[PDB]
């Protein structure tokens, strides 16, 4: 037992991108997309 007697309930989904945590996955998945970074074209004419 590794100081984990009780807990099974609120899976602390950690962001593999930054490394943060969220109470619910529905709040993390929507964040894991923030790293995508969709910046416009600069030096190129897009
Ligand atoms: Zn993140």
PDB file of N, CA, C and O and ligand atoms in Angstrom:
ATOM      1  N   UNK A   1       0.807  -1.206   0.000  1.00  0.00           N
ATOM      2  CA  UNK A   1       0.000   0.000   0.000  1.00  0.00           C
ATOM      3  C   UNK A   1       0.843   1.260   0.000  1.00  0.00           C
ATOM      4  O   UNK A   1       1.619   1.497   0.925  1.00  0.00           O
ATOM      5  N   UNK A   2       0.691   2.071  -1.043  1.00  0.00           N
ATOM      6  CA  UNK A   2       1.448   3.311  -1.163  1.00  0.00           C
ATOM      7  C   UNK A   2       0.554   4.521  -0.907  1.00  0.00           C
ATOM      8  O   UNK A   2       0.072   5.159  -1.843  1.00  0.00           O
ATOM      9  N   UNK A   3       0.336   4.830   0.366  1.00  0.00           N
ATOM     10  CA  UNK A   3      -0.503   5.959   0.747  1.00  0.00           C
ATOM     11  C   UNK A   3      -1.655   6.136  -0.238  1.00  0.00           C
ATOM     12  O   UNK A   3      -1.988   7.255  -0.627  1.00  0.00           O
ATOM     13  N   UNK A   4      -2.260   5.022  -0.638  1.00  0.00           N
ATOM     14  CA  UNK A   4      -3.368   5.074  -1.574  1.00  0.00           C
ATOM     15  C   UNK A   4      -4.536   4.214  -1.137  1.00  0.00           C
ATOM     16  O   UNK A   4      -5.173   3.554  -1.960  1.00  0.00           O
ATOM     17  N   UNK A   5      -4.820   4.218   0.161  1.00  0.00           N
ATOM     18  CA  UNK A   5      -5.918   3.428   0.707  1.00  0.00           C
ATOM     19  C   UNK A   5      -7.231   3.766   0.008  1.00  0.00           C
ATOM     20  O   UNK A   5      -7.918   2.884  -0.507  1.00  0.00           O
ATOM     21  N   UNK A   6      -7.573   5.050  -0.006  1.00  0.00           N
ATOM     22  CA  UNK A   6      -8.806   5.507  -0.637  1.00  0.00           C
ATOM     23  C   UNK A   6      -8.524   6.632  -1.626  1.00  0.00           C
ATOM     24  O   UNK A   6      -7.543   7.363  -1.491  1.00  0.00           O
ATOM     25  N   UNK A   7      -9.393   6.766  -2.625  1.00  0.00           N
ATOM     26  CA  UNK A   7      -9.221   7.805  -3.623  1.00  0.00           C
ATOM     27  C   UNK A   7     -10.037   7.547  -4.875  1.00  0.00           C
ATOM     28  O   UNK A   7     -10.649   8.461  -5.427  1.00  0.00           O
ATOM     29  N   UNK A   8     -10.045   6.295  -5.326  1.00  0.00           N
ATOM     30  CA  UNK A   8     -10.788   5.920  -6.522  1.00  0.00           C
ATOM     31  C   UNK A   8     -12.100   6.690  -6.619  1.00  0.00           C
ATOM     32  O   UNK A   8     -13.070   6.372  -5.933  1.00  0.00           O
ATOM     33  N   UNK A   9     -12.122   7.706  -7.476  1.00  0.00           N
ATOM     34  CA  UNK A   9     -13.321   8.506  -7.647  1.00  0.00           C
ATOM     35  C   UNK A   9     -13.088   9.719  -8.527  1.00  0.00           C
ATOM     36  O   UNK A   9     -13.759   9.893  -9.543  1.00  0.00           O
ATOM     37  N   UNK A  10     -12.136  10.559  -8.134  1.00  0.00           N
ATOM     38  CA  UNK A  10     -11.819  11.763  -8.893  1.00  0.00           C
ATOM     39  C   UNK A  10     -10.473  11.623  -9.597  1.00  0.00           C
ATOM     40  O   UNK A  10      -9.458  12.139  -9.128  1.00  0.00           O
ATOM     41  N   UNK A  11     -10.472  10.923 -10.726  1.00  0.00           N
ATOM     42  CA  UNK A  11      -9.251  10.714 -11.496  1.00  0.00           C
ATOM     43  C   UNK A  11      -8.596  12.046 -11.848  1.00  0.00           C
ATOM     44  O   UNK A  11      -9.120  12.812 -12.657  1.00  0.00           O
ATOM     45  N   UNK A  12      -7.447  12.315 -11.236  1.00  0.00           N
ATOM     46  CA  UNK A  12      -6.720  13.554 -11.485  1.00  0.00           C
ATOM     47  C   UNK A  12      -5.990  13.497 -12.824  1.00  0.00           C
ATOM     48  O   UNK A  12      -4.790  13.233 -12.877  1.00  0.00           O
ATOM     49  N   UNK A  13      -6.724  13.745 -13.902  1.00  0.00           N
ATOM     50  CA  UNK A  13      -6.148  13.720 -15.242  1.00  0.00           C
ATOM     51  C   UNK A  13      -5.064  14.784 -15.389  1.00  0.00           C
ATOM     52  O   UNK A  13      -5.342  15.982 -15.330  1.00  0.00           O
ATOM     53  N   UNK A  14      -3.828  14.337 -15.583  1.00  0.00           N
ATOM     54  CA  UNK A  14      -2.701  15.247 -15.741  1.00  0.00           C
ATOM     55  C   UNK A  14      -2.461  15.565 -17.213  1.00  0.00           C
ATOM     56  O   UNK A  14      -2.511  14.679 -18.067  1.00  0.00           O
ATOM     57  N   UNK A  15      -2.199  16.836 -17.505  1.00  0.00           N
ATOM     58  CA  UNK A  15      -1.950  17.270 -18.874  1.00  0.00           C
ATOM     59  C   UNK A  15      -0.540  16.889 -19.317  1.00  0.00           C
ATOM     60  O   UNK A  15       0.445  17.420 -18.809  1.00  0.00           O
ATOM     61  N   UNK A  16      -0.455  15.968 -20.271  1.00  0.00           N
ATOM     62  CA  UNK A  16       0.833  15.516 -20.784  1.00  0.00           C
ATOM     63  C   UNK A  16       1.561  16.649 -21.501  1.00  0.00           C
ATOM     64  O   UNK A  16       2.768  16.577 -21.729  1.00  0.00           O
ATOM     65  N   UNK A  17       0.818  17.694 -21.852  1.00  0.00           N
ATOM     66  CA  UNK A  17       1.394  18.841 -22.542  1.00  0.00           C
ATOM     67  C   UNK A  17       2.180  19.721 -21.575  1.00  0.00           C
ATOM     68  O   UNK A  17       3.406  19.802 -21.647  1.00  0.00           O
ATOM     69  N   UNK A  18       1.464  20.380 -20.670  1.00  0.00           N
ATOM     70  CA  UNK A  18       2.092  21.255 -19.687  1.00  0.00           C
ATOM     71  C   UNK A  18       2.425  20.489 -18.410  1.00  0.00           C
ATOM     72  O   UNK A  18       3.536  20.579 -17.891  1.00  0.00           O
ATOM     73  N   UNK A  19       1.452  19.733 -17.909  1.00  0.00           N
ATOM     74  CA  UNK A  19       1.661  18.962 -16.698  1.00  0.00           C
ATOM     75  C   UNK A  19       0.716  19.367 -15.583  1.00  0.00           C
ATOM     76  O   UNK A  19       0.965  19.078 -14.412  1.00  0.00           O
ATOM     77  N   UNK A  20      -0.372  20.039 -15.945  1.00  0.00           N
ATOM     78  CA  UNK A  20      -1.358  20.484 -14.968  1.00  0.00           C
ATOM     79  C   UNK A  20      -2.349  19.371 -14.648  1.00  0.00           C
ATOM     80  O   UNK A  20      -2.208  18.245 -15.127  1.00  0.00           O
ATOM     81  N   UNK A  21      -3.352  19.692 -13.838  1.00  0.00           N
ATOM     82  CA  UNK A  21      -4.369  18.720 -13.457  1.00  0.00           C
ATOM     83  C   UNK A  21      -5.756  19.351 -13.443  1.00  0.00           C
ATOM     84  O   UNK A  21      -5.900  20.556 -13.232  1.00  0.00           O
ATOM     85  N   UNK A  22      -6.777  18.530 -13.667  1.00  0.00           N
ATOM     86  CA  UNK A  22      -8.155  19.008 -13.681  1.00  0.00           C
ATOM     87  C   UNK A  22      -9.067  18.060 -12.910  1.00  0.00           C
ATOM     88  O   UNK A  22      -8.827  16.853 -12.859  1.00  0.00           O
ATOM     89  N   UNK A  23     -10.115  18.614 -12.309  1.00  0.00           N
ATOM     90  CA  UNK A  23     -11.062  17.819 -11.536  1.00  0.00           C
ATOM     91  C   UNK A  23     -11.742  16.774 -12.417  1.00  0.00           C
ATOM     92  O   UNK A  23     -11.974  15.643 -11.990  1.00  0.00           O
ATOM     93  N   UNK A  24     -12.056  17.162 -13.648  1.00  0.00           N
ATOM     94  CA  UNK A  24     -12.710  16.261 -14.590  1.00  0.00           C
ATOM     95  C   UNK A  24     -11.957  16.221 -15.916  1.00  0.00           C
ATOM     96  O   UNK A  24     -11.278  17.178 -16.284  1.00  0.00           O
ATOM     97  N   UNK A  25     -12.084  15.107 -16.630  1.00  0.00           N
ATOM     98  CA  UNK A  25     -11.415  14.943 -17.916  1.00  0.00           C
ATOM     99  C   UNK A  25     -12.011  15.878 -18.962  1.00  0.00           C
ATOM    100  O   UNK A  25     -11.304  16.375 -19.840  1.00  0.00           O
ATOM    101  N   UNK A  26     -13.315  16.114 -18.864  1.00  0.00           N
ATOM    102  CA  UNK A  26     -14.008  16.987 -19.804  1.00  0.00           C
ATOM    103  C   UNK A  26     -13.427  18.397 -19.764  1.00  0.00           C
ATOM    104  O   UNK A  26     -13.590  19.172 -20.706  1.00  0.00           O
ATOM    105  N   UNK A  27     -12.751  18.721 -18.667  1.00  0.00           N
ATOM    106  CA  UNK A  27     -12.146  20.038 -18.504  1.00  0.00           C
ATOM    107  C   UNK A  27     -10.682  20.022 -18.931  1.00  0.00           C
ATOM    108  O   UNK A  27     -10.075  21.073 -19.145  1.00  0.00           O
ATOM    109  N   UNK A  28     -10.120  18.824 -19.052  1.00  0.00           N
ATOM    110  CA  UNK A  28      -8.726  18.672 -19.454  1.00  0.00           C
ATOM    111  C   UNK A  28      -8.608  18.530 -20.968  1.00  0.00           C
ATOM    112  O   UNK A  28      -7.825  19.232 -21.609  1.00  0.00           O
ATOM    113  N   UNK A  29      -9.391  17.618 -21.535  1.00  0.00           N
ATOM    114  CA  UNK A  29      -9.373  17.382 -22.974  1.00  0.00           C
ATOM    115  C   UNK A  29      -9.526  18.692 -23.741  1.00  0.00           C
ATOM    116  O   UNK A  29      -8.845  18.921 -24.739  1.00  0.00           O
ATOM    117  N   UNK A  30     -10.425  19.548 -23.264  1.00  0.00           N
ATOM    118  CA  UNK A  30     -10.668  20.834 -23.905  1.00  0.00           C
ATOM    119  C   UNK A  30      -9.465  21.758 -23.746  1.00  0.00           C
ATOM    120  O   UNK A  30      -9.325  22.743 -24.472  1.00  0.00           O
ATOM    121  N   UNK A  31      -8.599  21.434 -22.791  1.00  0.00           N
ATOM    122  CA  UNK A  31      -7.407  22.235 -22.537  1.00  0.00           C
ATOM    123  C   UNK A  31      -6.213  21.695 -23.319  1.00  0.00           C
ATOM    124  O   UNK A  31      -5.384  22.462 -23.810  1.00  0.00           O
ATOM    125  N   UNK A  32      -6.131  20.373 -23.428  1.00  0.00           N
ATOM    126  CA  UNK A  32      -5.037  19.733 -24.148  1.00  0.00           C
ATOM    127  C   UNK A  32      -4.992  20.201 -25.599  1.00  0.00           C
ATOM    128  O   UNK A  32      -4.014  19.970 -26.308  1.00  0.00           O
ATOM    129  N   UNK A  33      -6.061  20.861 -26.034  1.00  0.00           N
ATOM    130  CA  UNK A  33      -6.144  21.363 -27.401  1.00  0.00           C
ATOM    131  C   UNK A  33      -5.601  22.786 -27.493  1.00  0.00           C
ATOM    132  O   UNK A  33      -5.317  23.282 -28.583  1.00  0.00           O
ATOM    133  N   UNK A  34      -5.457  23.434 -26.341  1.00  0.00           N
ATOM    134  CA  UNK A  34      -4.945  24.798 -26.292  1.00  0.00           C
ATOM    135  C   UNK A  34      -3.474  24.847 -26.693  1.00  0.00           C
ATOM    136  O   UNK A  34      -2.980  25.877 -27.153  1.00  0.00           O
ATOM    137  N   UNK A  35      -2.780  23.727 -26.518  1.00  0.00           N
ATOM    138  CA  UNK A  35      -1.367  23.641 -26.864  1.00  0.00           C
ATOM    139  C   UNK A  35      -1.181  23.566 -28.377  1.00  0.00           C
ATOM    140  O   UNK A  35      -0.142  23.958 -28.907  1.00  0.00           O
ATOM    141  N   UNK A  36      -2.197  23.057 -29.068  1.00  0.00           N
ATOM    142  CA  UNK A  36      -2.145  22.927 -30.519  1.00  0.00           C
ATOM    143  C   UNK A  36      -1.536  24.168 -31.160  1.00  0.00           C
ATOM    144  O   UNK A  36      -0.718  24.069 -32.074  1.00  0.00           O
ATOM    145  N   UNK A  37      -1.941  25.339 -30.675  1.00  0.00           N
ATOM    146  CA  UNK A  37      -1.423  26.583 -31.213  1.00  0.00           C
ATOM    147  C   UNK A  37      -1.716  26.741 -32.692  1.00  0.00           C
ATOM    148  O   UNK A  37      -1.025  26.163 -33.531  1.00  0.00           O
ATOM    149  N   UNK A  38      -2.741  27.524 -33.012  1.00  0.00           N
ATOM    150  CA  UNK A  38      -3.123  27.753 -34.399  1.00  0.00           C
ATOM    151  C   UNK A  38      -2.870  29.203 -34.801  1.00  0.00           C
ATOM    152  O   UNK A  38      -3.807  29.978 -34.999  1.00  0.00           O
ATOM    153  N   UNK A  39      -1.597  29.564 -34.920  1.00  0.00           N
ATOM    154  CA  UNK A  39      -1.218  30.921 -35.298  1.00  0.00           C
ATOM    155  C   UNK A  39      -1.272  31.098 -36.812  1.00  0.00           C
ATOM    156  O   UNK A  39      -1.028  30.167 -37.580  1.00  0.00           O
ATOM    157  N   UNK A  40      -1.598  32.322 -37.255  1.00  0.00           N
ATOM    158  CA  UNK A  40      -1.689  32.651 -38.680  1.00  0.00           C
ATOM    159  C   UNK A  40      -0.325  32.661 -39.360  1.00  0.00           C
ATOM    160  O   UNK A  40       0.701  32.435 -38.719  1.00  0.00           O
ATOM    161  N   UNK A  41      -0.321  32.925 -40.664  1.00  0.00           N
ATOM    162  CA  UNK A  41       0.918  32.961 -41.432  1.00  0.00           C
ATOM    163  C   UNK A  41       1.607  34.314 -41.287  1.00  0.00           C
ATOM    164  O   UNK A  41       0.956  35.358 -41.280  1.00  0.00           O
ATOM    165  N   UNK A  42       2.932  34.288 -41.173  1.00  0.00           N
ATOM    166  CA  UNK A  42       3.689  35.518 -41.029  1.00  0.00           C
ATOM    167  C   UNK A  42       4.547  35.815 -42.243  1.00  0.00           C
ATOM    168  O   UNK A  42       4.199  36.642 -43.087  1.00  0.00           O
ATOM    169  N   UNK A  43       5.697  35.133 -42.342  1.00  0.00           N
ATOM    170  CA  UNK A  43       6.630  35.313 -43.457  1.00  0.00           C
ATOM    171  C   UNK A  43       6.078  34.765 -44.769  1.00  0.00           C
ATOM    172  O   UNK A  43       6.584  35.082 -45.847  1.00  0.00           O
ATOM    173  N   UNK A  44       5.040  33.942 -44.672  1.00  0.00           N
ATOM    174  CA  UNK A  44       4.421  33.347 -45.851  1.00  0.00           C
ATOM    175  C   UNK A  44       3.032  33.930 -46.088  1.00  0.00           C
ATOM    176  O   UNK A  44       2.330  34.294 -45.144  1.00  0.00           O
ATOM    177  N   UNK A  45       2.641  34.015 -47.356  1.00  0.00           N
ATOM    178  CA  UNK A  45       1.337  34.558 -47.718  1.00  0.00           C
ATOM    179  C   UNK A  45       0.268  33.470 -47.685  1.00  0.00           C
ATOM    180  O   UNK A  45      -0.013  32.829 -48.697  1.00  0.00           O
ATOM    181  N   UNK A  46      -0.325  33.268 -46.513  1.00  0.00           N
ATOM    182  CA  UNK A  46      -1.356  32.258 -46.366  1.00  0.00           C
ATOM    183  C   UNK A  46      -2.700  32.851 -45.992  1.00  0.00           C
ATOM    184  O   UNK A  46      -3.621  32.811 -46.806  1.00  0.00           O
TER     185      UNK A  46
HETATM  186 ZN1  LIG B   1      -1.914  21.579 -20.701  1.00  0.00          ZN
END
